Design a protein around this ligand. Structure first.
Ligand SMILES: [Zn+2]
Ligand SMILES: [Zn+2]
Ligand SMILES: [Zn+2]
Ligand SMILES: [Zn+2]
Length: 114
DNA sequence: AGGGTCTCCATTTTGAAGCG
DNA sequence: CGCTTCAAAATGGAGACCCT
């Protein structure tokens, strides 16, 4: 197993090919948004970051009455679930039955338990 | 192959309602 | 005004996907 070179990086890899790709993430952040300065290692991310600027919401809710738009594919899926009702984050407390559909929504709930 | 891309997830970060 | 709540915006890493 190849351990990631990168000074403080704890990570380990099967093939040094996976290690090298990975290593890429600590690299110089060459891709700098001309609008505000944020920089990204890849260009894909800088492109995507642009949606912070335009406001473009490409993905839309084909639910009757909804039609809400989101800028990101994944973010849309996470909301349509408020239609499906899929609350996939079941609380852990023995005998507390609250479910959630966001691991932020659920774990801070846990905080309440304490 | 193997390098840029992109799809996709998990996560983090931000905001708006509810409500006490 | 305090939260907890629920909902959205955004980021970062893995690794699949697509070349030539
Ligand atoms: Zn590393
Ligand atoms: Zn920017
Ligand atoms: Zn919807
Ligand atoms: Zn609980």
């Amino acid at each position: 197993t190849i351990a990631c070179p990168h000074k403080g990086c704890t990570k380990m890899f099967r093939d040094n090919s996976a290690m090298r790709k990975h290593l890429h993430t600590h690299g110089p952040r060459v891709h700098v948004c001309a609008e505000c300065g944020k920089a990204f290692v890849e260009s894909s991310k800088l492109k995507r970051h642009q949606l912070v600027h335009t406001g473009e919401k490409p993905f839309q809710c084909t639910f009757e009455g909804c039609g809400k738009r989101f800028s990101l594919d994944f973010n849309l899926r996470t909301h349509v679930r408020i239609h499906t009702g899929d609350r996939p984050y079941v609380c852990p407390f023995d005998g507390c039955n609250k479910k959630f559909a966001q691991s932020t929504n659920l774990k801070s709930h846990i905080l309440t338990h304490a």
